[PDB]
């Protein structure tokens, strides 16, 4: 009737990827843990572009949808910094967004290229996170791409560039005791980089008893947070989100009786 | 709502391993065609001696083609009939087939057995050239193949002269919807 | 000496590749003008 | 001078007849067109094939509807003269008559 | 036109490998190895690479 | 119909213009629903 | 000459008087929505705001429809329109002031479509009654017109870009005869083969096949999921 | 109200009555400047 | 034909036709006669030899072209009625080699099968291995699909005009589609597809699409409407000019905002325009100004992208604007892979609620398996499991129609060494629940195309509209 | 043998015409011809 | 006329390697407009002299 | 020009409540709750704590329609269990279960980078 009693086992933790096994969970648990890091671990991204000049061959909304696109170092600064909703500035200010600055001109005969180590921001903490570098635009000579940019905080359940992970490969019973998933040929089908099954084996024996538990996870990160901040922000939103929930619920609670 | 969040759970789809046979089958399949075809070029030799004895209320010719494509239309069927007791429970051709949710008994065959026998205004592939269907051919060439049998399923793919004739025969279902199409709502309106 | 079958399938593309670097795609546009 | 006549874009007498792809690009042309339209009032104008019967040739038809049993017509026309064809058919009656 | 910033299917950054891949591809490397060398492992992110058409190379040789 | 060793009550035709200057007009109205009743069932169709 | 004028398939008596375009109607392109009854037809917020019902104005709806009046043609949703018992349009965007907008007895306010109301949704070409069905409006967020997966082979409609027209009843009177003649539930027989005219179609077809097999077995947490969709379900957890 | 020639690109200001024309180049395909309003992009 | 083989007096656009049953040679000379170039074939051989194609290998540098293989006599040009007495080979390797005498008098033989199709038909994948309509429906969608239509799109300034932000060439490819500079201009995306029956909002030819894939400009395309606008002096009674109309030089002017019209009469480029706006101000002196400017239509919101100025071809001013509306995909856009499996979208999910595989993977779109049986456009499969095969080993696919080289069980064997399911099915997890799919899906990379054809520009309603005078009844305003 | 049938066939019989497309009887015999194929 | 005596819309087996097979309109033009083959050519005529 | 602003999915607009209890009168001791701006991610996680619950008869969850952002509730528990009761305890588990996750988290970063 009580809480699961988890236990983390982290595989490897390198700077692009955290892998990790967590055990004794419910599969609703395992899986809403990894939908937070896709959609809800808060990251900062630029949502907010004024183009001074661009005679580049990308329009504007070509260039402002690159800009949100590049990742910028968020790991502490996006804690403290608040949403621009909840902000009480005049739209925007040092609190909840971070300026960004793009002034590139091309005089040489060769191409020039725009990328991402051209955005300067004022906050040094909130940086592209490649400063090879992400390539913006190729500008020709005279032509100039001009703009100034606002990065602000949000999740990726509101668009995929606060989305801070790469790829979240996410397993559980790697050799199909539970028979969640039935082959019509075993045989035909690779082992899972988790099996633990034979050579001769295809599929472990059914588990009538069993359970989904042993989630085996591997968190790669854009650059935006480190893969284990991710995880911990993610745990820690989503007990907030609950928390949240749960004060509300008791209000409610309150006014019926 | 109830089946469609089952669904979510239970999943359907279909992919290359719906269309593929097992290697028996195939050679059952594919020993059901020649023998189909000596059985074809048995009636043309027939038919070439003066052997072929016309039937009551048809002439040489049109004994010559019904004999002929009774014996096309009975390898098509007993091949389509063969890859469909290759499917197993979990062929997901055979289980939206078997539920009648899309598709026939025909398309599995096809997809997987045997195209068949393409028709323009229901005969055979016509001499369009001289007296040859089409210059890869010789001249008076009766056999499956230049009249336009079909002998391989969509998986395996049609060689150049199927897939002309194949476009023979399905340029004219286009035509019949556009057919259709003008006509649909004619008798309607003059009942009306 | 002679095209072996399995020198085949390049050969046969390399022949379709000079027709329409020397001819294009709207030759008969052009060839018909030009006449 | 009698007139001018419209020309077919990369046509040996169009302005982009030799030039390289860089030349094209210097003109803001794409080296990818293929040419082979008109722009007429800045509109670009193909002209689609238009498939009629050979001329010069004898082609006998049947009608059952027609009172001619056969009929052989042959489109004459002069060669690169006198655009105007004229049609001769040489039919047979039809033995429905008794 | 150019290389999309981010991968479509998974969010992982492409905008600073395709002069990497153009680099080792001029070096003899095959595609598939030069998008290993690069660490694309997910075919969805090596699709991004290996289909990419840089359409804005021929769009900079007009004069603006 | 009048030939001898012929059904005259089985025996039919599909033209109705010919049913009806033969037969009559209640022969049309019933011959009119065999016709288009083969026509909608040739293909296994109902309608009431 | 006047001749020419009725002559033709566009003349005033064929082209003015058998066939005319209609106010109040919508058309758009039909995506699936599963979510949605069979009676139930899912509404773009644009088409709802742009369409309207004048309801009469009564005791029983005088602080519903004043409250509308006040949302006016900004809010969704709104009112377009004021009908005064003189029969006089007040354009009600031009000016939102509460002093000339106090409604009363026999006014009729122009309201914007919401939930629930009637509509008739067509399909072309119209061969049968049920190409023409009436529908509850559903408002969506997003731009298309939604179907349930059941009434498609009624209208013999697909979601591969075909649109559907929306004709929405302007009085009680024509929304009455909507709702007791031609809405989808009452057209599910139909009299030219006495059989449905819908049935499940491809996805709930194939796997209602599936889901009836012998050995199909729902553990105890997939079976209190698929009831929370059974609406009719009478919250009685059968005896596994 | 500067606008640019297509050919040359050269900005020169041209009045609503005065004749359409570069001041130097000659050429009569000209473009308007980009405006100096400012107008913001959803990076989105 | 020895002449016309060496470009003697007879060219090689002329066709004779011997009728041997008829005694009839008839020689043909004229235009519009319809021929396709053949290889030549003598005693059961090809004249094109090795050294014709080492020679052709250094087309460049070497001034050895196609023409050098029609002097050569290796390769003549047969018209429609000289096929008739023509002995046609399909190919060298098959038909003339040694084997049962079915024919020994060939007298020509194809270059490639494959060249019987036309332009839009030769960039579908695996056309034999689909029913024929579905390729007819594809040609017809190829037209209709997205991309960069030239190079050059910048400069013109057409009515309209859809550019894809981010075109993709064909992971699975077809020979022909080298010549047709698809690979340069391509229409379409290699997409993740996954054929699956997801949450039923990709029934009956309905798209499920990843709207975090959408985010991150996936399919995105902008639009582009110009619009052109010219000053007439004809007539001295009555003149226009573009400019700015003001209340007071004109006795009627409608209330909509003329503040975006810059003193010429000419919107800028870089300012937002609706329904409300005007982007062309002209006005026309009466016999005070009447006002006759161009407004746009309510449909239409976007950026002013490029104004030009200039003299039309009867020498008066006009202008040629362009506006640009970027078209993010949404429910009720047309997209279609190249087997003629046009759709809508149904519903777009974001990436944590799409399905996903061991790694992390989500498709891009899911469509329903139910669109596959009865179209039996199985070379869509071929074409995702080719593909798959394709973006694991880093080599653009080969889906050349009719070659024998290549087969599904060698498609099939080729993923089995990347670590996947031969068949191309995988084992996908729930994306709400997290829980593995009892049935394992088939996902991989198809080409898909974004068709012209979005919900916003059909979208329209109609509730007391402006009613024509004369008849009083309905028309557009 | 072969009659007209689908739209065609429908349009003959509400567009009545002395002249079917493919005009034919049904002749059932009612003496021994019924039975043996020698007398029919 | 022409096309009232013979239908045009049909595929016809002269079209192999001249007209494309698969490409054509779908509705009330189906099988009237066509498009070449890639290889296929169409002579531009000279003299017979 | 129907589209929703993304914020739509996870921010309440003025005067709607993030969660509302309605008793199920078709049998006792059953109480749906309309959870606003949420998603599976909650609905999910809350419904298989309260299976685990044995005083709980019924836990289950559904988002009504995808393009609307709310998800019913629907908890039945024995007679002398509430299930705004078991709602609540619920909740708390899941804090405790996920509270206990990330303090094992970072123990696991430590002992990683540690060594
Ligand atoms: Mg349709
Ligand atoms: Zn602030
Ligand atoms: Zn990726
Ligand atoms: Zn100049």
Same mark, same amino acid.
């Given at each position: 009737?009580?809480?699961?009693?988890?236990?983390?086992?982290?595989?490897?933790?390198?700077?692009?990827?955290?892998?990790?096994?967590?055990?004794?969970?419910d599969?609703? $648990?395992?899986?809403?843990?990894?939908?937070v890091?896709?959609?809800?671990?808060?990251?900062?991204?630029?949502?907010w572009?004024?183009?001074?000049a661009?005679?580049?061959?990308?329009?504007?909304?070509?260039?402002?949808?690159?800009?949100? =696109?590049?990742?910028?170092?968020?790991?502490?600064?996006?804690?403290? =910094?608040?949403?621009?909703?909840?902000?009480?500035?005049?739209?925007?200010?040092?609190?909840?967004? $971070?300026?960004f600055?793009?002034?590139v001109?091309?005089?040489?005969?060769?191409?020039?290229?725009?990328?991402?180590?051209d =955005?300067?921001?004022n906050?040094?903490?909130?940086?592209?996170?490649?400063?090879?570098?992400?390539?913006?635009?190729?500008l020709?000579?005279?032509?100039?791409?001009?703009?100034?940019?606002?990065?602000?905080?949000?999740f990726?359940?509101?668009?995929?560039?606060?989305?801070?992970?790469?790829?979240?490969?996410?397993?559980? %019973?790697? %050799?199909?005791?539970?028979?969640?998933?039935?082959?019509?040929?075993?045989?035909?089908w690779?082992?899972?980089?988790?099996?633990?099954?034979?050579?001769?084996?295809?599929?472990?024996?059914?588990?009538?008893?069993?359970?989904?538990?042993?989630?085996?996870?591997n968190v790669?990160?854009?650059?935006?947070?480190?893969?284990?901040t991710? $995880?911990?922000?993610?745990?820690?939103?989503?007990?907030?989100?609950?928390?949240?929930?749960?004060?509300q619920?008791?209000?409610?609670?309150?006014?019926?009786? | 709502?109830?089946?469609?969040?089952?669904?979510?759970?239970?999943?359907?789809?279909?992919?290359?391993?719906?269309?593929?046979?097992?290697?028996k089958?195939?050679?059952?399949?594919?020993?059901?065609?020649?023998?189909?075809?000596?059985?074809?070029?048995?009636?043309?030799?027939?038919?070439?001696?003066?052997?072929?004895?016309?039937?009551?209320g048809?002439?040489?010719?049109?004994?010559?083609?019904?004999?002929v494509?009774?014996?096309?239309?009975?390898?098509?069927?007993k091949?389509?009939?063969?890859?469909?007791?290759?499917?197993?429970?979990?062929?997901?051709?055979?289980?939206?087939?078997?539920?009648?949710?899309?598709?026939?008994?025909?398309?599995?065959?096809?997809?997987?057995?045997?195209?068949?026998?393409?028709?323009?205004?229901?005969?055979?592939?016509?001499?369009?050239?001289?007296?040859?269907?089409?210059?890869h051919?010789?001249?008076?060439?009766?056999?499956?193949?230049?009249?336009?049998?079909?002998?391989?399923?969509?998986?395996?793919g049609?060689?150049?002269?199927?897939?002309?004739?194949?476009?023979?025969?399905?340029?004219?279902?286009?035509?019949?919807?556009?057919?259709?199409?003008?006509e649909?709502?004619?008798?309607?309106?003059?009942?009306? | 000496?002679?095209?072996?079958?399995?020198?085949?399938?390049?050969?046969?593309?390399?022949?379709?590749?000079?027709?329409?670097?020397?001819?294009?795609?709207?030759?008969?546009?052009?060839?018909?003008?030009?006449? | 001078?009698?007139?001018?006549?419209?020309?077919?874009?990369?046509?040996?007498?169009?302005?982009?007849?030799?030039l390289?792809?860089?030349?094209?690009?210097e003109?803001?042309?794409?080296?990818?067109?293929?040419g082979?339209?008109?722009?007429?009032?800045?509109?670009?104008?193909?002209?689609?094939?238009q498939?009629?019967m050979?001329?010069?040739?004898?082609?006998?038809?049947?009608?059952?509807?027609?009172?001619?049993?056969?009929?052989?017509?042959c489109?004459?026309?002069?060669?690169?003269?006198?655009?105007?064809?004229?049609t001769?058919?040489?039919?047979?009656?039809?033995?429905?008559?008794? | 036109?150019?290389?999309?910033?981010?991968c479509?299917?998974?969010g992982?950054?492409v905008?600073?490998?395709?002069?990497?891949?153009?680099?080792?591809?001029?070096?003899?490397?095959?595609?598939?190895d030069?998008?290993?060398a690069?660490?694309?492992?997910?075919?969805?992110?090596?699709?991004?690479l290996?289909?990419?058409?840089?359409?804005?190379?021929?769009?900079?040789?007009?004069?603006? | 119909?009048?030939?001898?060793?012929?059904?005259?009550? &089985?025996?039919?035709?599909?033209?109705?213009?010919?049913?009806?200057?033969?037969?009559?007009?209640?022969?049309? &109205?019933?011959?009119?629903? &065999?016709?288009?009743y083969?026509?909608?069932?040739?293909?296994?169709?109902?309608?009431? | 000459?006047?001749?020419?004028?009725?002559?033709?398939k566009?003349?005033?008596?064929?082209?003015?008087?058998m066939? +005319?375009?209609?106010?109040?109607?919508?058309?758009?392109?039909?995506?699936?929505?599963?979510?949605?009854?069979?009676?139930?037809?899912?509404?773009?917020?644009?088409?709802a705001?742009?369409?309207?019902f004048?309801?009469?104005?009564?005791?029983?709806?005088?602080?519903?429809?004043?409250?509308?009046?006040?949302?006016?043609?900004?809010?969704?949703?709104?009112?377009?329109?004021?009908?005064?018992?003189?029969?006089?349009?007040?354009?009600?965007?031009?000016?939102? +002031?509460?002093?000339?907008?106090?409604?009363?007895?026999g006014?009729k306010?122009?309201?914007?479509?919401?939930?629930?109301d009637?509509?008739?949704?067509?399909?072309?070409?119209?061969?049968?009654?049920?190409?023409?069905?009436?529908?509850?409006?559903?408002?969506?967020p997003?731009?298309t017109?939604?179907?349930?997966?059941?009434?498609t082979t009624?209208?013999?409609?697909?979601?591969?870009?075909?649109?559907?027209?929306?004709?929405?009843?302007?009085?009680?009177?024509?929304?009455?005869?909507?709702?007791?003649?031609?809405?989808?539930?009452?057209?599910?027989?139909?009299?030219?083969?006495?059989?449905?005219?819908?049935?499940?179609?491809?996805?709930?077809?194939?796997?209602?096949? +599936?889901?009836?097999?012998?050995?199909?077995?729902?553990?105890?947490?997939?079976?209190?999921?698929?009831?929370?969709?059974?609406?009719?379900?009478d919250? +009685?957890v059968?005896?596994? | 109200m500067?606008?640019?020639?297509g050919?040359?690109?050269?900005?020169?200001?041209?009045?609503?009555?005065?004749?359409?024309?570069?001041?130097e180049?000659?050429?009569?395909?000209?473009?308007?400047?980009?405006?100096?309003?400012?107008?913001?992009?959803?990076?989105? | 034909?020895?002449?016309?083989?060496?470009?003697?007096?007879?060219?090689?656009?002329?066709?004779?036709?011997?009728d041997? *049953?008829?005694?009839?040679?008839?020689?043909?000379?004229?235009?519009?006669?319809?021929?396709?170039?053949?290889?030549?074939?003598?005693?059961?051989?090809?004249?094109?030899?090795?050294?014709?194609?080492?020679?052709?290998?250094?087309?460049?540098?070497?001034?050895?072209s196609?023409?050098?293989?029609?002097?050569?006599?290796?390769?003549?040009?047969?018209?429609?009625?000289?096929?008739?007495?023509?002995?046609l080979?399909?190919?060298?390797?098959?038909?003339?080699?040694?084997?049962?005498?079915?024919?020994?008098?060939?007298?020509?033989?194809?270059?490639?099968?494959?060249?019987?199709?036309?332009?839009?038909?030769?960039?579908?994948?695996?056309?034999?291995? #689909?029913?024929?309509?579905?390729?007819?429906?594809?040609?017809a969608?190829?037209?209709?699909?997205?991309?960069?239509?030239?190079?050059?799109?910048?400069?013109?300034?057409?009515?309209?005009?859809?550019?894809?932000?981010?075109?993709?060439?064909?992971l699975?490819?077809?020979?022909?589609?080298?010549?047709?500079?698809?690979?340069?201009?391509? !229409?379409?995306?290699?997409?993740?597809?996954?054929?699956?029956?997801?949450?039923?909002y990709?029934?009956?030819?309905?798209?499920?699409?990843?709207?975090?894939?959408?985010?991150?400009?996936?399919?995105?395309?902008?639009?582009?409407?110009?619009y052109?606008?010219?000053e007439?002096?004809?007539?001295?009674?009555?003149?226009?000019?573009?400019?700015?109309?003001?209340?007071?030089?004109?006795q009627?002017?409608?209330?909509?905002?003329?503040?975006?019209?810059?003193?010429?009469?000419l919107?800028?480029?870089?300012?937002?325009?609706?329904?409300?706006?005007?982007?062309?101000?002209?006005?026309?002196?009466?016999?005070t100004?009447?006002?006759?400017?161009?407004?746009?239509?309510?449909?239409?919101?976007?950026?002013?992208?490029?104004?030009?100025?200039?003299?039309? @071809?009867?020498?008066?001013?006009?202008?040629?604007? *362009?506006?640009?509306?970027?078209?993010?995909?949404?429910?009720?856009?047309?997209?279609?892979?190249?087997?003629?499996?046009?759709?809508?979208?149904?519903? @777009?999910?974001?990436?944590?609620?799409?399905?996903?595989?061991?790694?992390?993977?989500?498709?891009?779109?899911?469509?329903?398996?139910?669109?596959?049986?009865? *179209?039996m456009?199985?070379?869509?499969?071929?074409?995702?499991?080719?593909?798959?095969?394709? !973006?694991?080993?880093?080599?653009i696919?080969? !889906?050349?129609?009719?070659?024998?080289?290549?087969?599904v069980?060698?498609?099939?064997?080729?993923?089995?060494?990347?670590?996947?399911?031969?068949?191309? #099915?995988?084992?996908?997890? #729930?994306?709400?629940?997290?829980?593995?799919?009892?049935? @394992?899906?088939?996902?991989?990379?198809?080409?898909?195309? *974004?068709?012209?054809?979005?919900?916003?520009?059909?979208?329209?309603?109609?509730?007391?509209?402006?009613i024509?005078?004369?008849?009083?009844?309905?028309?557009?305003? | 043998?072969?009659?007209?049938?689908?739209?065609?066939?429908?349009?003959?019989?509400?567009?009545?015409?002395?002249?079917?497309?493919?005009?034919?009887?049904?002749?059932?015999l009612?003496?021994?011809?019924?039975?043996?194929?020698?007398?029919? | 006329?022409?096309?009232?005596?013979?239908?045009?819309?049909?595929?016809?087996?002269?079209?192999?390697?001249?007209?494309?097979?698969?490409?054509?309109?779908?509705?009330?033009?189906?099988?009237?407009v066509?498009?070449?083959?890639?290889?296929?050519?169409?002579?531009?005529?000279?003299?017979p002299? | 020009?129907?589209?929703?602003?993304?914020?739509?999915?996870?921010?309440?607009?003025?005067?709607?409540?993030?969660?509302?209890?309605?008793?199920?009168?078709?049998?006792?001791?059953?109480?749906?709750?309309?959870?606003?701006?949420?998603?599976?991610?909650?609905?999910?996680?809350?419904?298989?704590?309260?299976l685990?619950?044995?005083?709980?008869?019924?836990?289950?969850?559904?988002?009504?329609?995808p393009?609307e952002?709310?998800?019913?509730?629907?908890?039945?528990?024995?007679?002398?269990?509430?299930?705004?009761?078991?709602?609540?305890?619920?909740?708390?588990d899941?804090?405790?279960?996920?509270?206990?996750?990330?303090?094992r988290?970072?123990?696991?970063?430590?002992?990683?980078?540690?060594?």
């Amino acid at each position: 009737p009580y809480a699961n009693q988890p236990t983390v086992r982290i595989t490897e933790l390198t700077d692009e990827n955290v892998k990790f096994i967590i055990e004794n969970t419910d599969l609703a $648990v395992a899986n809403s843990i990894r939908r937070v890091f896709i959609a809800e671990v808060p990251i900062i991204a630029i949502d907010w572009v004024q183009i001074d000049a661009n005679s580049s061959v990308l329009h504007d909304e070509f260039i402002a949808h690159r800009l949100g =696109l590049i990742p910028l170092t968020s790991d502490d600064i996006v804690d403290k =910094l608040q949403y621009s909703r909840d902000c009480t500035c005049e739209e925007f200010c040092p609190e909840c967004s $971070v300026e960004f600055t793009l002034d590139v001109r091309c005089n040489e005969d060769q191409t020039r290229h725009v990328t991402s180590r051209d =955005l300067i921001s004022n906050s040094p903490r909130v940086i592209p996170v490649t400063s090879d570098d992400i390539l913006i635009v190729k500008l020709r000579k005279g032509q100039e791409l001009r703009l100034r940019a606002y990065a602000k905080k949000g999740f990726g359940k509101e668009h995929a560039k606060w989305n801070p992970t790469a790829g979240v490969a996410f397993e559980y %019973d790697p %050799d199909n005791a539970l028979r969640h998933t039935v082959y019509p040929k075993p045989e035909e089908w690779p082992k899972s980089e988790y099996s633990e099954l034979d050579e001769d084996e295809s599929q472990a024996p059914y588990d009538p008893n069993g359970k989904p538990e042993r989630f085996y996870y591997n968190v790669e990160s854009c650059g935006s947070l480190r893969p284990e901040t991710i $995880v911990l922000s993610a745990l820690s939103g989503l007990k907030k989100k609950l928390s949240d929930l749960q004060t509300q619920l008791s209000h409610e609670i309150q006014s019926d009786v | 709502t109830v089946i469609n969040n089952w669904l979510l759970i239970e999943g359907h789809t279909i992919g290359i391993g719906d269309s593929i046979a097992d290697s028996k089958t195939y050679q059952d399949i594919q020993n059901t065609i020649k023998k189909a075809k000596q059985d074809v070029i048995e009636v043309i030799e027939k038919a070439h001696n003066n052997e072929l004895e016309p039937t009551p209320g048809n002439t040489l010719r049109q004994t010559f083609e019904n004999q002929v494509n009774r014996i096309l239309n009975d390898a098509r069927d007993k091949t389509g009939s063969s890859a469909q007791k290759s499917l197993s429970e979990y062929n997901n051709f055979k289980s939206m087939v078997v539920s009648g949710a899309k598709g026939s008994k025909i398309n599995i065959s096809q997809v997987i057995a045997v195209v068949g026998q393409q028709n323009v205004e229901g005969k055979r592939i016509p001499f369009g050239f001289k007296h040859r269907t089409l210059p890869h051919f010789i001249k008076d060439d009766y056999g499956p193949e230049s009249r336009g049998f079909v002998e391989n399923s969509y998986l395996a793919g049609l060689t150049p002269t199927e897939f002309f004739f194949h476009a023979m025969g399905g340029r004219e279902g286009l035509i019949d919807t556009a057919v259709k199409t003008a006509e649909t709502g004619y008798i309607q309106r003059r009942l009306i | 000496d002679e095209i072996t079958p399995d020198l085949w399938q390049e050969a046969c593309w390399i022949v379709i590749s000079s027709y329409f670097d020397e001819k294009g795609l709207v030759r008969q546009q052009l060839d018909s003008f030009d006449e | 001078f009698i007139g001018k006549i419209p020309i077919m874009l990369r046509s040996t007498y169009c302005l982009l007849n030799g030039l390289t792809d860089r030349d094209l690009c210097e003109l803001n042309e794409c080296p990818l067109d293929p040419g082979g339209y008109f722009i007429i009032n800045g509109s670009e104008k193909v002209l689609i094939a238009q498939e009629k019967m050979a001329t010069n040739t004898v082609y006998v038809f049947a009608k059952k509807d027609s009172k001619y049993a056969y009929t052989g017509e042959c489109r004459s026309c002069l060669e690169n003269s006198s655009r105007p064809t004229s049609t001769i058919w040489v039919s047979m009656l039809a033995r429905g008559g008794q | 036109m150019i290389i999309p910033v981010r991968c479509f299917t998974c969010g992982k950054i492409v905008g600073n490998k395709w002069e990497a891949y153009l680099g080792l591809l001029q070096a003899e490397y095959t595609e598939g190895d030069a998008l290993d060398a690069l660490g694309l492992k997910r075919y969805c992110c090596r699709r991004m690479l290996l289909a990419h058409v840089d359409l804005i190379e021929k769009l900079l040789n007009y004069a603006p | 119909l009048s030939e001898k060793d012929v059904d005259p009550v &089985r025996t039919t035709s599909n033209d109705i213009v010919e049913i009806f200057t033969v037969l009559g007009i209640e022969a049309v &109205r019933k011959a009119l629903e &065999r016709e288009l009743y083969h026509v909608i069932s040739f293909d296994g169709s109902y309608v009431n | 000459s006047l001749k020419q004028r009725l002559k033709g398939k566009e003349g005033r008596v064929r082209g003015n008087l058998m066939g +005319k375009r209609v106010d109040f109607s919508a058309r758009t392109v039909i995506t699936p929505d599963p979510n949605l009854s069979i009676d139930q037809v899912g509404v773009p917020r644009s088409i709802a705001a742009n369409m309207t019902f004048a309801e009469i104005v009564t005791p029983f709806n005088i602080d519903r429809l004043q409250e509308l009046v006040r949302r006016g043609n900004s809010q969704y949703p709104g009112a377009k329109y004021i009908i005064r018992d003189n029969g006089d349009r007040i354009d009600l965007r031009f000016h939102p +002031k509460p002093s000339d907008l106090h409604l009363q007895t026999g006014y009729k306010v122009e309201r914007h479509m919401c939930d629930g109301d009637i509509v008739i949704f067509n399909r072309q070409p119209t061969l049968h009654k049920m190409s023409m069905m009436g529908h509850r409006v559903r408002i969506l967020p997003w731009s298309t017109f939604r179907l349930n997966l059941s009434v498609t082979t009624p209208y013999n409609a697909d979601f591969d870009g075909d649109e559907m027209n929306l004709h929405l009843p302007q009085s009680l009177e024509t929304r009455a005869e909507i709702q007791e003649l031609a809405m989808v539930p009452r057209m599910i027989v139909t009299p030219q083969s006495n059989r449905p005219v819908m049935g499940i179609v491809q996805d709930t077809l194939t796997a209602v096949r +599936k889901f009836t097999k012998r050995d199909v077995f729902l553990e105890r947490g997939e079976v209190m999921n698929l009831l929370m969709f059974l609406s009719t379900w009478d919250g +009685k957890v059968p005896q596994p | 109200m500067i606008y640019i020639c297509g050919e040359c690109h050269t900005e020169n200001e041209i009045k609503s009555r005065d004749p359409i024309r570069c001041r130097e180049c000659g050429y009569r395909i000209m473009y308007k400047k980009r405006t100096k309003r400012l107008v913001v992009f959803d990076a989105r | 034909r020895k002449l016309r083989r060496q470009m003697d007096i007879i060219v090689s656009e002329v066709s004779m036709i011997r009728d041997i *049953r008829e005694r009839e040679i008839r020689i043909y000379t004229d235009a519009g006669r319809i021929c396709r170039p053949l290889l030549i074939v003598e005693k059961q051989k090809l004249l094109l030899k090795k050294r014709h194609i080492d020679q052709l290998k250094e087309r460049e540098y070497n001034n050895y072209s196609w023409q050098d293989l029609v002097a050569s006599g290796v390769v003549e040009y047969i018209d429609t009625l000289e096929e008739e007495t023509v002995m046609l080979a399909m190919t060298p390797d098959d038909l003339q080699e040694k084997e049962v005498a079915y024919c020994s008098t060939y007298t020509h033989c194809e270059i490639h099968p494959s060249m019987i199709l036309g332009v839009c038909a030769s960039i579908i994948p695996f056309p034999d291995h #689909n029913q024929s309509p579905r390729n007819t429906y594809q040609s017809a969608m190829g037209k209709q699909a997205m991309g960069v239509y030239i190079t050059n799109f910048h400069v013109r300034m057409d009515t309209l005009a859809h550019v894809l932000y981010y075109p993709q060439k064909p992971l699975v490819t077809t020979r022909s589609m080298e010549y047709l500079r698809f690979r340069e201009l391509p !229409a379409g995306i290699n997409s993740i597809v996954a054929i699956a029956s997801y949450t039923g909002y990709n029934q009956e030819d309905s798209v499920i699409m990843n709207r975090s894939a959408v985010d991150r400009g996936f399919f995105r395309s902008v639009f582009y409407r110009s619009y052109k606008e010219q000053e007439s002096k004809k007539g001295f009674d009555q003149e226009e000019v573009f400019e700015k109309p003001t209340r007071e030089t004109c006795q009627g002017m409608r209330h909509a905002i003329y503040d975006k019209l810059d003193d010429d009469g000419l919107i800028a480029p870089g300012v937002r325009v609706s329904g409300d706006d005007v982007i062309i101000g002209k006005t026309v002196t009466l016999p005070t100004k009447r006002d006759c400017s161009t407004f746009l239509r309510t449909s239409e919101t976007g950026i002013v992208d490029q104004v030009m100025v200039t003299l039309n @071809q009867e020498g008066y001013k006009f202008c040629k604007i *362009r506006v640009r509306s970027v078209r993010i995909p949404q429910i009720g856009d047309k997209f279609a892979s190249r087997h003629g499996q046009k759709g809508t979208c149904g519903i @777009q999910y974001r990436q944590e609620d799409m399905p996903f595989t061991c790694e992390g993977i989500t498709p891009d779109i899911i469509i329903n398996p139910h669109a596959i049986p009865s *179209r039996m456009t199985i070379g869509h499969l071929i074409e995702c499991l080719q593909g798959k095969v394709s !973006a694991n080993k880093g080599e653009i696919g080969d !889906a050349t129609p009719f070659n024998d080289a290549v087969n599904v069980q060698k498609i099939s064997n080729l993923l089995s060494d990347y670590g996947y399911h031969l068949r191309g #099915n995988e084992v996908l997890y #729930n994306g709400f629940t997290g829980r593995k799919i009892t049935s @394992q899906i088939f996902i991989g990379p198809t080409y898909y195309q *974004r068709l012209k054809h979005m919900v916003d520009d059909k979208i329209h309603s109609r509730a007391r509209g402006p009613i024509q005078i004369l008849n009083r009844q309905p028309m557009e305003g | 043998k072969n009659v007209t049938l689908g739209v065609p066939r429908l349009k003959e019989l509400i567009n009545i015409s002395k002249k079917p497309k493919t005009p034919s009887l049904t002749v059932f015999l009612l003496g021994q011809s019924a039975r043996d194929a020698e007398r029919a | 006329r022409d096309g009232k005596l013979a239908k045009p819309r049909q595929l016809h087996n002269t079209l192999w390697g001249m007209v494309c097979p698969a490409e054509t309109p779908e509705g009330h033009a189906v099988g009237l407009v066509k498009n070449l083959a890639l290889m296929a050519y169409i002579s531009v005529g000279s003299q017979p002299s | 020009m129907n589209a929703p602003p993304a914020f739509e999915s996870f921010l309440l607009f003025e005067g709607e409540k993030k969660i509302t209890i309605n008793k199920d009168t078709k049998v006792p001791n059953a109480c749906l709750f309309t959870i606003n701006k949420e998603d599976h991610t909650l609905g999910n996680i809350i419904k298989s704590q309260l299976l685990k619950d044995p005083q709980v008869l019924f836990a289950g969850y559904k988002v009504p329609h995808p393009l609307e952002h709310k998800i019913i509730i629907r908890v039945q528990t024995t007679p002398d269990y509430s299930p705004q009761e078991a709602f609540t305890n619920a909740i708390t588990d899941l804090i405790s279960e996920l509270s206990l996750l990330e303090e094992r988290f970072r123990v696991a970063i430590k002992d990683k980078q540690e060594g």
